[PDB]
Write a protein that binds this ligand. Structure first.
Ligand code: KDW
Lengths: 117, 117
């Protein structure tokens, strides 16, 4: 059965830093963008919406715009990686990564931000 | 863009009655069982795991085992229909139906159970 996995299901980070939430999925030989879908959401806020290689700035929630990107370099090697930069205390919470690729699966990732000084 | 739709996001049903939760996806004609995944969750309790035709009925909350069924007769009309016979008060809460077909989407449905006397 297709099982997405999370190396680290608990990221503690510092206010203002850079964070990279990883989700991994199985890839045999190369990666087929046809039949790959990657969706990242926090508390129902749309963070990453990647469908057969197309993405649209218009659908990103306003608190994640210009900070939250899906790294395409890791994707090619089975790693849906969310990278939030300039982290706010408001980014603390449970995130879900939902992948369709051979089959489907999702995983929760928890994040706390410790506060400045 | 592939979108899942609920004719109703909230159902009020009576203790002891039968209830069908419906969530619809688009279908051209020949249902490609090979391209279809239907997953039903209730508070993260795996209810339905239906993947390329086969149900891993191993993992199915015994809370619903033999009472929570995927009507695999409406799927062909683009209706992932969850039916729970003999509704207990425990069946009250938020259900989530996740479909991967052309692409992918999910929707929440709430169930309020009442028991008039
Ligand atoms: C204009 C337009 O309206 N368009 C789109 C509009 N929205 C944009 C959008 C746009 C897009 C693209 C998307 O994609 C999702 C997506 C992406 C990728 C995959 C899936 C998906 C599809 C089918 C099934 C499943 C999940 O199956 C399973 C889950 C399972 O269980 C996982 C699990 C269970 N329990 C706890 C955890 C944890 N932790 C994990 C298991 C069993 N396990 C694995 C197997 N065995 C082992 C060893 O594990 C099996 C299946 C098949 C998923 C995630 C989904 C839904 C979702 C989208 O909106 C979501 C959304 C946003 N806001 C509000 C609501 C509401 N209401 C909904």
């Amino acid at each position: 059965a297709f099982t997405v996995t999370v190396p680290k299901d608990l990221y503690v980070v510092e206010y203002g830093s850079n964070m990279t939430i990883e989700c991994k999925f199985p890839v045999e030989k190369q990666l087929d963008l046809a039949a790959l879908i990657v969706y990242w959401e926090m508390e129902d806020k749309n963070i990453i919406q990647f469908v057969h290689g197309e993405e649209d700035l218009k659908v990103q929630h306003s608190s994640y715009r210009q900070r939250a990107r899906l790294l395409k370099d890791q994707l090619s090697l089975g790693n849906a990686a969310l990278q939030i930069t300039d982290v706010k205390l408001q980014d603390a919470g449970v995130y879900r990564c939902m992948i369709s690729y051979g089959g489907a699966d999702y995983k929760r990732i928890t994040v706390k931000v410790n506060a400045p000084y």
